[PDB]
């Protein structure tokens, strides 16, 4: 702490704000999901598996915009914790299909409840028009960075 | 892959979009910063240290909206890689002040260049008015989730 000033060399604050928002939501999700052992992004992988049963690790990486190594490590942990089953694919011998276990089906509703609670917090004091606007413009930002990720990966 | 439908139980797509955008930018930053050994958020901690020399681990955690354990692990790695020096604080015996090393001062400009390049990608095809709007509304979202993080942490 001291006397501060704006950073003149950074063209925009937009990614700092996106990092702040993202670290904050994940730090808070780390509190809620510690007891369930779903902290550090685990709940993210789980929801996608529940929403798309049979998805494979490659598809799951592409959906989440991370590399396969990240996905592999997270899937191993979720299997060990009994949230996911993997089965070798019938047609590609080194693919796996991911499926949710009976356990994770109860948690799924819990997770979605939590997401809607975080969503409500994000939108505190938003008008409906602001909601729509920011929703749409984030989509546009998202698609730009998606495109780049497919080129660069 | 198959035939899909919208998830009716999720009040909004906004945090999915924020996760997509954030994972994508970090996955891309993991490519650019692999050679410098600044992947997995390391470059984030480093920039804050360069921008605020003398900052301590507690302040740095609060600025980045993560818990102190995360910060400690990242700082240890950055010291080991020679990007940061830590010194015990004169007045709180178990605080440390973080400072950038000579090495990291060259990288800092590189990192900021990269951030401006990512920013440009995010804003591809944006009008000036859209830029301002999304910038402002993300700030508002950010502040809501900040508040909650201070309550819950």
Author numbering:
A (entry chain A), B (entry chain A): 16 to 168
Question: What does the published report state?
Answer:
Clostridium difficile is an anaerobic human pathogen that causes acute healthcare-associated diarrhoea. The MarR protein, as a member of the MarR family of multiple antibiotic resistance proteins, is a key global regulator in C. difficile. The transcription factors of the MarR family regulate diverse genes involved in multiple antibiotic resistance, the synthesis of virulence determinants and many other important biological processes.
In this study, we solved the crystal structure of MarRC.difficile by molecular replacement. Diffraction data were collected to 2.3 Å resolution. We found that the crystal structure reveals MarRC.difficile to be a dimer, with each monomer consisting of six α-helices and a three-stranded antiparallel β-hairpin. In the crystal structure of MarRC.difficile there is one monomer in the asymmetric unit, with the dimer being composed of two subunits related by a crystallographic twofold rotation. Two helical regions, α1 and α6 (residues 9–27 in the N-terminus and residues 123–147 in the C-terminus, respectively), are closely juxtaposed and intertwine with the equivalent regions of the second subunit to form a dimer. The crystal structure also indicates that α-helices in the N- and C-terminal regions of each subunit interdigitate with those of the other subunit to form a hydrophobic core burying a surface area of 3100 Å2. The dimer is stabilized by several salt bridges, notably that between Arg16 and Glu74′ and that between Lys155 and Glu145′. In addition, a hydrogen bond between the side-chain carbonyl O atom of Glu66 and the guanidinium NH groups of Arg31′ enhances the stability of the dimeric structure. Structural analysis of MarRC.difficile indicated that two cysteine residues (Cys45 and Cys117) are located in the hydrophobic core; this may suggest that MarR in C. difficile is probably not an oxidation sensor.
